[PDB]
Amino acid sequence: ELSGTVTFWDTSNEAEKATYQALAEGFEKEHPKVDVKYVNVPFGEANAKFKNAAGGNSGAPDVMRTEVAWVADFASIGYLAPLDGTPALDDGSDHLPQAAASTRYEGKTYAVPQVIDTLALFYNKELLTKAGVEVPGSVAELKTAAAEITEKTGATGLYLRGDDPYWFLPYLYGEGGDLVDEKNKTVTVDDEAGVRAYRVIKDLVDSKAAITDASDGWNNMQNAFKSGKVAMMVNGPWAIEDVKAGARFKDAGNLGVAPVPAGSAGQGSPQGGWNLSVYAGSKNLDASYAFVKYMSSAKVQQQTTEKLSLLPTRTSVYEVPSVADNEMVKFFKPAVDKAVERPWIAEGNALFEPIRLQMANVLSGETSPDEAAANTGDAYRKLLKDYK
């Protein structure tokens, strides 16, 4: 017997949310005495909304779609139910290891993996063909390509998202850098790779290879890509269905995807994704654990991919012929296997804010790449007291 209310806060976007609400309410098929109360909470509001509710014990959800960085964030302040030895964990070993690391805090499991992701370079196949160019493998080749795309088609080569710090990471990795050396507790973002990365992004916009905006970046990016204003953008699996809604990409066929470009030293893209957690103060714990088990089951992960092309965390699901043949999946899974894994620390998501501010000021010309990198590092040393 399961019964009662299970309130689920989902952060999925406008293209994803009808699918996730249907999946959530499908828990009631097998458990008709449970009432699933689906709520969609915008991504940028959800961390604060959950903390406010959990800290007040007031209108907190039973189950929270928890970003990979949010697990240690929320768990560090006691807001998540530990899951070890509960029915929430079924076939745990099925999950990709890097997925499983984000679920852990101080030797306890506080979430179950849902989707895994990384950033990639999406491109308009027809524009590149019309421009006579190949999909660029590096920043250097992207600049050459962008000039041909402007000269032959009038589009801009790249929409470079300028208001979300996560988009700095491919450039950092491509210049040979990283945020921190975790094993050695050393801040590394202000090494010369960080200077070079800020410089590359500024050059892409100044040279007119790319355009950007200081606000409303998600909408501006998607609108520029879908309208053919740009030929390329960096984005993740959560954009696929949104892009395919557009006249230009109905023909799933016109939507190309490739790795983010290499920089002067190498290439990399960050690992991201979503897990599912239970609020520590839930008044319907059995029903919530079962709900988490259901939402993370192989069946529901397979359905998510079939409807949205989001990537499963469960290895078995890749073997299901239907997942094994989705062309967005066949590209993204190897890219995810290569993606760079961050420190899963309480302060992890706070590492993004200094990048946000310094990247904005580099793009507007208020701050040099040199000063931006040093400022980022200074902010990290303040955030991480036992880092040098």
Ligand X SMILES: C[C@H]1O[C@H](O[C@H]2[C@H](O)[C@@H](O)[C@@H](O[C@H]3[C@H](O)[C@@H](O)[C@@H](O)O[C@@H]3CO)O[C@@H]2CO)[C@H](O)[C@@H](O)[C@@H]1N[C@H]1C=C(CO)[C@@H](O)[C@H](O)[C@H]1O
Q: Which residues bind ligand X (CB under 6 A)?
A: 11-13, 16, 43-44, 47, 67-69, 117, 164-166, 218, 236, 238, 272-274, 349, 352, 356
Residue number of the CB closest to ligand X reads 272
Spatial strand order in the sheet of 156-159: 210-211, 156-159, 230-235, 120-124, 255-258
Instruction: Report d(CA 329, CA 326) in Å as an integer.
Output: 5
Task: Give whichever of 118 and 124 is closer to ligand X, judged by the CB atom.
Answer: 118
Q: Least distance from C-beta 358 to ligand X, angstroms?
A: 13
Query: Nearest approach, Cβ of 108 to ligand X (angstroms)?
Result: 20
Least Å from the CB of residue 95 to ligand X: 16
Beta carbon nearer to ligand X, 7 or 13: 13
Give the residue with the Cβ less far from ligand X, 7 or 153.
Answer: 7
Least distance (Å) between residue 242 CB and ligand X = 10
Q: Where are the beta strands (DSSP E) in the chain?
A: 4-10, 34-40, 63-67, 104-105, 108-109, 112-118, 120-124, 156-159, 180-181, 186-187, 210-211, 230-235, 255-258, 271-278, 311-312
Closer to ligand X by CB, 117 or 190: give it: 117
Q: Which is nearer to ligand X, 102 or 284 (CB)?
A: 102
| Token code pair at residue 78 | 């006691």
- Among residues 117 and 191, whose Cβ is nearest to ligand X? 117
Smallest distance from ligand X to CB 229, Å:
20
CB of 161 to ligand X, least distance (A): 8
CA–CA distance, 83 with 54 (Å, rounded to integer): 17
Q: For residue 247, count CB atoms less than 10 angstroms from its CB and return exposed for 0-12, middle for 13-18, buried for 19 or more.
A: exposed
Q: CA nearest 337: which of 238, 266, 268?
A: 268
- Angle between helical axes of 17-25 and 298-308 (0-180°, round to 10): 150
Whose Cβ is closer to ligand X: residue 2's or residue 295's?
Answer: 295
What's the min distance (Å) between Cβ of 169 and ligand X? 9
Buried (b) or exposed (e) across 268-297, using 16+ Cβ within 10 A? bbbbbbbbbbbbbbbebbbbbbbbbbbbbb
| CB-nearer residue toward ligand X: 48 or 324 | 48
84-105 in b/e form (b: 16+ CB < 10 A) is eebebbeeeebbbebbbbbbbb
Helix, strand, coil proportions of the chain in percent (round to 5)? Answer: 50, 20, 35
Shortest distance, position 149 Cβ to ligand X, whole Å: 25
